[PDB]
Amino acid sequence: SQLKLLVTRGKEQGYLTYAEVNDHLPEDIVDSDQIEDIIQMIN
Amino acid sequence: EFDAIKIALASPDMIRSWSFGEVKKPETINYRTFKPERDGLFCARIFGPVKDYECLCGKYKRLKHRGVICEKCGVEVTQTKVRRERMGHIELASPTAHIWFLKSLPSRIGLLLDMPLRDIERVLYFESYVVIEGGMTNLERQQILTEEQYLDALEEFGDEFDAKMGAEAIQALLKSMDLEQECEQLREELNETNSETKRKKLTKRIKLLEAFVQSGNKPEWMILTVLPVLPPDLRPLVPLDGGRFATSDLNDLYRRVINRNNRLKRLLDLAAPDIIVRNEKRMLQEAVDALLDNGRRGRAITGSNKRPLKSLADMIKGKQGRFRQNLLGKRVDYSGRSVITVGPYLRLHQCGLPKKMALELFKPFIYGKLELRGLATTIKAAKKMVEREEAVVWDILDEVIREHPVLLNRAPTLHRLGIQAFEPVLIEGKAIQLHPLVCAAYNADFDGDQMAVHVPLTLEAQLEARALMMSTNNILSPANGEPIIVPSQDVVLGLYYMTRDCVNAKGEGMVLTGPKEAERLYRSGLASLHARVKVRITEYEKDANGELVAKTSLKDTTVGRAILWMIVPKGLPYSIVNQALGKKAISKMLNTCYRILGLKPTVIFADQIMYTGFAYAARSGASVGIDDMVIPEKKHEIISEAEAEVAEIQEQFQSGLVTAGERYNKVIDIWAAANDRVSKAMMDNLQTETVINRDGQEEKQVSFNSIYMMADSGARGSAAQIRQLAGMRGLMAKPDGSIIETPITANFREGLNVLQYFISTHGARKGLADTALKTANSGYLTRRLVDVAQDLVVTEDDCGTHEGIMMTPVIEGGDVKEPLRDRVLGRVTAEDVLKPGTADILVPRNTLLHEQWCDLLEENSVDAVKVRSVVSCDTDFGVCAHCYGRDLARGHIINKGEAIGVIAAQSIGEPGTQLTMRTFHISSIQVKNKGSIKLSNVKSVVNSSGKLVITSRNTELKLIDEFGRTKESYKVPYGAVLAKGDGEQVAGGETVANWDPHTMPVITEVSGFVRFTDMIDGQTITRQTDELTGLSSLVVLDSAERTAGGKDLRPALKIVDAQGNDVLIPGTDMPAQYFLPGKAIVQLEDGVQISSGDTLARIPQKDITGGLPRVADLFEARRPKEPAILAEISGIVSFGKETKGKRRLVITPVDGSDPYEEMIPKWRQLNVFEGERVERGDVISDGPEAPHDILRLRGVHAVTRYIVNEVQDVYRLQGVKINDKHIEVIVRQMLRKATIVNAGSSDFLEGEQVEYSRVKIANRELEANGKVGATYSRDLLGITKASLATESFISAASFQETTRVLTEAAVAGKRDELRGLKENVIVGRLIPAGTGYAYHQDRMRRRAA
Amino acid sequence: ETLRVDPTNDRLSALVEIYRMMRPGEPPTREAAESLFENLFFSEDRYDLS
Amino acid sequence: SDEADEAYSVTEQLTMTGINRIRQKINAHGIPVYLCEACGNPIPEARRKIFPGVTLCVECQAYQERQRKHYA
Amino acid sequence: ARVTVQDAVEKIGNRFDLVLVAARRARQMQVGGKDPLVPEENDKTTVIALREIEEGLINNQILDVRERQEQQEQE
Ligand SMILES: [Mg+2]
Ligand SMILES: [Zn+2]
Ligand SMILES: [Zn+2]
Ligand SMILES: [Zn+2]
């Protein structure tokens, strides 16, 4: 998956900003609630 | 009273046994008569009466009915405190998963059944079904089905198969599951199978199962079948002003759970359409999870006023929770607060306490003393008398106050000297008069600051203010022995004005018969405070065995030094007062008074020095005027020259001779040089300008400029600030470091026009804003280090080991930066240290090296001393008294019960407040003095040239004179052309070796012809044409551009004789050939000679961080990005497959596992040859060393020495001094974890990370037995992970994620034996550290009687 | 380079990728895409550079 | 002491390290090249006399300065 | 009053043993009944017990044997 590279990216940099999270999301994730829950997962 | 705190899950029968009655209705109270409605969220029948000893109806109100349960409303007549401890229970008609045990990540429910999380939450919300032992037909235990799958299942598989849905299914799943059976299956899958990470996760699950079995927990308790409601007086509903009540959100959450539960009961007893019933069950589940932890599954609900309702989990956790903000620090009675003023008349143990602030703090004692002396009949008469302030109350108060200390405490108590005990002095006013000398301790001035007062009430608590926390016992800073009773600013200037001299003043050159006559001359007005004079002074010396041998003589001193001599205590010399006495000298005088005469003479010397300083500062009349900033008249011509050079550069820029950035740099360099010039001119005009006449013509002396006197005495000022007042302000700077090129060529004495001022405001506001954070995030490092290193306590007088640290001076660069007397002072040696010729048994093993033994050490010029450190102490759960040494302040030896961990954290963190909040960056040896050569890794060859060349790799050379002490240290490269070689004692003005970074030699062992073997150009070597010398060069390169045919093959230079035989390398039978990697140009030919290490292959061609982040990172133990890989094993090296980012680096040991190999990042400049025998614990590529690397390779003393030296580098960079005991303690907490290499006879897992103390004790008691212990391997953690692993879950819940800690404790069923400083404070007991340590030892002896 | 990384080639694919970005899930088309673009910043109803 | 009294030490460290790194950027020693290390042309006598030990011609210096200005 | 407890430290060693031994003796005098072994200078019980510890006539072993003697003669 692509979010794997996002998690390793955040671990490389030591952080993760809303820009990169909005980029690396599953494209057809239309659900803002699962959006919030997946960022709450990565955090 | 109570031993450890046990924890576990809660059986529904246990939760029904807690409760005093079910809660059936969501009623709080009646709306007209505000009595509890039912049988509701506030109920008198369950949660006790709402008034003391009073039934609800009113039928029973007398105390005689105590305990009765009233017949009408069943309200048990008892105290209203009972309404604050009784609990209720809500009976969930449907089960409900505990959100802590379904979102704990890993989900305990999930990882117990081994059903992944989304499957669990898909069966939870009725999205699917899950079979539960679906008969002997088709399916698995935890096989999840979709809806229609289950529908078609019920057709083809009617019964003898049962799949449920929702939390009921999870309950049945956990229930039916048998832990020992699955644990056996996990045994079979772990030992009959080998798939490493799969078995890592497998064994984690296995350990969880064994923990759930060891504890009394049953897995089916993770589903809330019964819900207990908090007692009402913790979630109260209180009447405010106006009748509008005030409620905690827990009432909202309990109400939302209760309504939904009642509606689920309703719908269940209606046979409702089961989709509606699904929705009701789902909503009730969400409600129970908002109640348990809101905002943990979805979005916080809601709240009623648009803000997330807080739930029980929010009541525990959070910075503003319950574990932190009223559990560790709470509000306190018997305490006041007032503006502090100075009051220099106080003795050093006492402080002025206002009468009005003292009549309120001691009201209990005053009532008692009035009622005792009979002045007032009873407590009420006493209260009235104090309330009207009778005449006798001030005598009663002066008697209450007399020996009763009070704790004075400033706001940011960074170090422990911020809470000091004073004896009060009833003063008139409303402002605490604080002794001047203490203000350096408090870090407190009198610009409006305030302080808090507390009264130590009980006997044992008011002998601790007298014996530990008193102002006189604490004159030394715990971070370093230097006395913090330094006279600060009026005192050092009073003493500077006093103890000075003038070339010709009144009464110069008249013999005086003692200090008394000097004082009488000065007071009479016949001789000035600084008139050179001879006085017969008699000084004492107690180098005798306690006896002071006296000696009188005519010193040639001044009247000031004479008068000051009367103040000095007996056994000090006269040279201590016979200089001009700055601030540094003034506190050195106190340090010598301490180190000769103990504590009490120094305590009296302190306030004597302070009184006499203030007296003579006032006598001096040292004001400051606008004429005292004499600007130098050479400033204008210097600025004209600077503007001239700047115009020259501007013309050379308009001419096309320099870039724009180059003009900027040259302009800034010109202005910086001009500013240093003008400041030197103003200082040369200021310091010496006083010109006086002595018997004739003239003479200059040190100036009496008032501002210069402040700058020179050390009271206030520097050269920089006086320069800004007198010289020029130089170049300002924008906030991001962008230096402005227009320099403020003015000072504040003359004007500053608008543009220069606006330029300066930039850096001004940047500095202001920066100290607005450094104040806000004041003590975060002490907090982080009181978390990792809190529960260490000196708990043993001796562990009796022989291991230590080989402490020596930090002799780096030139002369030493920190001598041996600084770093070995106060520590007990690890081994008997003899003289260099050994001469004697000089110092025994366990002798505390105080000042006398340091004298002994640097008479004999001892250079290395082994001294016991706390990171090697063999104690268990603590630190021996000797493996910590001498304790500062108190200054004798740490006594068992010292909380050395809190002190170490505070001593690393109060000094750290004085450091920069930002992290900032920064041929022939010019060897210095005479001395001898010192070789480390001695492998050198003398060429035919006669000079020396290092045929070794890391040969370190030291210049060591006839002292025995090392005086210079240097790192020598691989074979520099040493003018001086080995052991050659030479003097200054003689360079020890010439070299060149364009010259890294590949010098050989013997002399001879360099034939070329294993060399075919086109595959490994490069055609470097000698356009410079007129020859041909075949330079060694790697496989970077040459093809792979002979890419790995190395160009071998065969050093042989004139006959053609392979001359061996003397020492090993492998002949004297060299395999060369790149970067070494070859200028030889095939069949050509070289001398004894002639130039065969020649390799052509200090920043330090300093911010407090460079200490949080030094301690956090992370990994640098240029990590210098080291030599993992000894033996020889081989290079293998290349061009991958990991070129194979094989290490063949001498007798060990010969095929050992590692990877090499081939972007790196690899700086070691392949033929040289790699030594274990040695560097290969050159770059910053990693701490974990050193810890695994060279030993715990290696990592401790590295960490100590790095933190001491960043601390000495700013001049801030801190001892190394504290950093050794932080390290000792840092590397607290062991790892199990071999299981052995031990009883830990295979690769399990265990507490190193645990493995230590276990394998030690096995070593006493006949069985082989476990071969541990010491880890090394960061403070924020060495604190994460703590035995007691109370403290862990205190400073960590509370939900994770309590979930782990609940499943594991941990028992918290309260034996930590941070746990006992929470449960109100004595900390087992200091005064209560003997009590805790007696408790441990009572237990296990 | 940004054209060499542009996975689109012509206008309507540009609109459809903008559409899949803006309101995902919906199957895009010519009319809805051109309308979305022309009512993103180029309609006084919605945009306002004041 | 007061907030204006440690703010001084902050600003002082700041301007001090700034001037330090900038006057370290200058070159005072001498290693006369007489030809740029990027364009090979002789660094003229004038430019090599202003900055002893200059290592690049004027235009190569401008190019590298711009490139580093973008931080690339 | 008493400015320093340096002398009382040497008689008992530990600085916490000193506090716990002196609070014990001073509570013996305070509540109660027992008398000071030293001429009280209008001090409180805390500094009185400290001053008695200074003169070596109060400490843990002495106080404990004084406990034992009265435990005997209480019978
Ligand atoms: Mg202040
Ligand atoms: Zn009743
Ligand atoms: Zn020890
Ligand atoms: Zn050039």
String of DSSP letters for B286-352:
HHHHHHHHTTSSSS----TTSSPPP-HHHHHSSTTSSSSTTTTS---SSEEEEEEE--TT--TTEEE
Chains A and C touch (3+ CB pairs under 8 A): yes
Token reading at B695 = 């018997």
Are the CB atoms for B887 and B898 separated by under 8 Å? yes
Q: Do B763 and D13 touch (CB under 8 A)?
A: no
Give the residue among C20, C21, C10, C15 at the shortest CA–CA distance from C33. Answer: C15
SS3 for B620-647 is HCCCCCCCCCCCCCCHHHHHHHHHHHHH
Q: What are phi and psi of B638, to 5 degrees?
A: -65, -40
CA–centroid distance, B244 to ligand 2, in Å, is 28
Neighbours of chain B (3+ CB pairs under 8 A): A, D, E
N-to-C CA span, chain B? 16
Strands (E) located in chain D: none
Residue carrying structure tokens 């991001």: B736
Where b means 16+ CB within 10 Å and e means fewer, B514-544 reads bbebbbebbeeeebbbbbbbbbebebeeeee
Residue E43, chain B, CB below 8 Å: the answer is: yes
Q: Which helix (H) or strand (E) holds B162?
A: none
Strands (E) located in B478-531: 480-483, 511-512
Q: Which helix (H) or strand (E) holds B137?
A: none
Give the C-alpha separation, B1119 to B1128, whole Å: 17
Give the C-alpha separation, B724 to B745, whole Å: 10
Give the residue among B1314, B1334, B1289, B1305 at the shortest CA–CA distance from B1. Answer: B1314
Radius of gyration for the alpha carbons in chain D, expressed in angstroms and rounded = 18
Q: Describe the crossing of helices B1333-1342 and E15-30 by its angle, rounded to 10 degrees.
A: 80
Are the CB atoms for B652 and B658 separated by under 8 Å? yes
Token reading at B494 = 């009073």
Q: Which residues contact C25 (CB under 8 A, 6 or more apart)?
A: A28, A30
CATH code, domain carrying E43: 3.90.940.10
* DSSP-derived secondary structure letter, B796: E
Are the CB atoms for B969 and B958 separated by under 8 Å? yes
Chains B and D touch (3+ CB pairs under 8 A): yes
Show the CA angle centred on residue B463, arms to residues B460 and B466, nearest 5°: 160
Q: Which residues of E touch B403 (CB under 8 A)?
A: 1-2, 43-44, 46-47
Strands B19-22 and B87-90: parallel
Show the CA angle centred on residue B447, arms to residues B446 and B448, nearest 5°: 90
Residue carrying structure tokens 């025998």: B1173
Give the C-alpha separation, B656 to B669, whole Å: 20
Count of domains forming chain E: 1
Cβ burial of B1319 (10 Å; 0-12, 13-18, 19+) is buried
* DSSP-derived secondary structure letter, B1174: B
Are the CB atoms for B993 and B979 separated by under 8 Å? yes
Token reading at B681 = 């001119």
Are the CB atoms for B99 and B125 separated by under 8 Å? no
Give the residue among B442, B452, B491, B421 at the shortest CA–CA distance from B357. Answer: B452
* DSSP-derived secondary structure letter, B1244: S
Task: State how far the alpha carbon of B1018 is from the alpha carbons of B307, B708, B975, B985, B1083, in Å.
Answer: 75, 75, 30, 49, 17
Show the CA angle centred on residue B886, arms to residues B881 and B888, nearest 5°: 120
Q: Do D7 and B767 touch (CB under 8 A)?
A: yes
Residue D38, chain B, CB below 8 Å: the answer is: no
Q: Describe the crossing of helices B584-597 and B490-498 by its angle, rounded to 10 degrees.
A: 90
Give the C-alpha separation, B29 to B45, whole Å: 13
Are the CB atoms for B537 and B565 separated by under 8 Å? yes
Compute, in degrees rounded to 10, the torsion defined by CA atoms B1199, B1201, B1205, B1206: 0
Give the C-alpha separation, B314 to B311, whole Å: 5
Q: Which residues contact B306 (CB under 8 A, 6 or more apart)?
A: none
Chains B and E touch (3+ CB pairs under 8 A): yes
Residue B1214 CA, chain-centre distance (Å), reads 17
Give the C-alpha separation, B1079 to B1096, whole Å: 13
Q: Which residues contact B850 (CB under 8 A, 6 or more apart)?
A: B825, B826, B886
Pairs of residues, one from chain A and one from chain C, whose beta carbons lie less than 8 Å apart? 7
Q: Which helix (H) or strand (E) holds B600?
A: helix B600-620
Q: What are phi and psi of B1272, to 5 degrees?
A: -75, 165
Q: Which helix (H) or strand (E) holds B533?
A: strand B532-541
Strands B1052-1056 and B1008-1013: antiparallel
Q: For B25-75, give the DSSP string.
A: S---B-SSS-SB-BSSSSBTTTS--SBTTB-SSSS--SGGGTT-B-TTT--
Q: Which helix (H) or strand (E) holds B909?
A: helix B900-909
Give the C-alpha separation, B217 to B1112, whole Å: 41
Give the C-alpha separation, B493 to B617, whole Å: 6
* DSSP-derived secondary structure letter, B733: B
3-state SS assignment for residue B507: coil
Token reading at B448 = 């409006």
Give the residue among B140, B132, B225, B124 at the shortest CA–CA distance from B172. Answer: B132
Give the residue among B786, B869, B881 at the shortest CA–CA distance from B1286. Answer: B786
Give the C-alpha separation, B639 to B1268, whole Å: 80
- How many other C-beta atoms lie within 10 A of the C-beta of residue B279? 14
Q: What are phi and psi of B998, to 5 degrees?
A: -75, 5
What ligand is nearest to the CA atom of residue B448? 1
Q: Which helix (H) or strand (E) holds C5?
A: none
Q: Which residues contact B335 (CB under 8 A, 6 or more apart)?
A: B361, B452, B453, B454, B455
Cβ burial of B302 (10 Å; 0-12, 13-18, 19+) is middle
Using a CB–CB cut-off of 8 Å, the residues of C that contact A are 20, 24-25
CA torsion through residues B382, B387, B389, B390, sign = negative
3-state SS assignment for residue E50: helix
Q: Which residues contact B195 (CB under 8 A, 6 or more apart)?
A: none
Specify the amino acid at residue B90. I
Going across the sheet that includes B1052-1056, the strands are B1073-1075, B1052-1056, B1008-1013, B1088-1090
Give the C-alpha separation, B379 to B400, whole Å: 16
3-state SS assignment for residue B705: coil
Are the CB atoms for B874 and B880 separated by under 8 Å? yes
N-to-C CA span, chain A? 18
Nearest chain B residue to A37 by CA: give it. B298
Q: Do B658 and D50 touch (CB under 8 A)?
A: yes
Are the CB atoms for B508 and B533 separated by under 8 Å? yes
3-state SS assignment for residue B159: coil
Radius of gyration for the alpha carbons in chain E, expressed in angstroms and rounded = 12
Give the C-alpha separation, B396 to B373, whole Å: 9
Give the C-alpha separation, A24 to A2, whole Å: 7
Give the residue among B253, B256, B174, B246 at the shortest CA–CA distance from B217. Answer: B174
Specify the amino acid at residue B385. M
Q: Which residues contact B1301 (CB under 8 A, 6 or more apart)?
A: B1289, B1292, B1293
**Domain range for E20:** 1-75
3-state SS assignment for residue C7: coil
B1322-1329's contacts with Cβ under 8 Å and 24+ in sequence apart are: B1322/B323, B1322/B327, B1322/B328, B1322/B1290, B1322/B1291, B1322/B1294, B1323/B5, B1323/B1290, B1327/B899, B1328/B793, B1329/B793, B1329/B897, B1329/B898, B1329/B899, B1329/B902
N-to-C CA span, chain E? 39
CB atoms within 5 A of ion ligand 3 belong to B 799, 873, 880, 883
3-state SS assignment for residue B581: coil
Show the CA angle centred on residue B846, arms to residues B841 and B852, nearest 5°: 70
Q: In the Cβ-directed half-sphere of A19, how many Cα atoms lie within 13 Å?
A: 1
Residue D47, chain B, CB below 8 Å: the answer is: yes
Q: Which helix (H) or strand (E) holds B436?
A: none
Are the CB atoms for B891 and B476 separated by under 8 Å? yes
Q: For chain A, give the DSSP string.
A: --HHHHHHHHHHHT---HHHHHHSS-TT---HHHHHHHHHHH-
Cβ burial of B125 (10 Å; 0-12, 13-18, 19+) is middle
Q: Which residues face B421 on adjacent strands?
A: B407, B470
CA torsion through residues B294, B299, B305, B307, sign = positive
Give the C-alpha separation, B596 to B1313, whole Å: 46
Q: Which residues of A touch C24 (CB under 8 A)?
A: 27-30
Q: Which residues contact B881 (CB under 8 A, 6 or more apart)?
A: B794, B796, B797, B798, B893, B894, B895, B896
Show the CA angle centred on residue B1283, arms to residues B1279 and B1289, nearest 5°: 170
Give the C-alpha separation, B103 to B100, whole Å: 6
Nearest chain C residue to A31 by CA: give it. C24
Q: Which residues contact B304 (CB under 8 A, 6 or more apart)?
A: B252
Give the C-alpha separation, B394 to B457, whole Å: 20
Give the C-alpha separation, B76 to B70, whole Å: 6
Using a CB–CB cut-off of 8 Å, the residues of B that contact A are 298-299
Token reading at B187 = 């045994």
Whether residue B838 is preceded by a cis peptide bond, meaning omega within 30 degrees of 0, is no
Residue carrying structure tokens 């002949």: B1071
Greatest alpha-carbon span in chain C: 36
Give the residue among B1284, B1280, B1304 at the shortest CA–CA distance from B104. Answer: B1304
Are the CB atoms for B353 and B427 separated by under 8 Å? yes
Strands B5-6 and B87-90: unpaired
Residue D20 CA, chain-centre distance (Å), reads 11
Q: Which residues of B touch D44 (CB under 8 A)?
A: 657
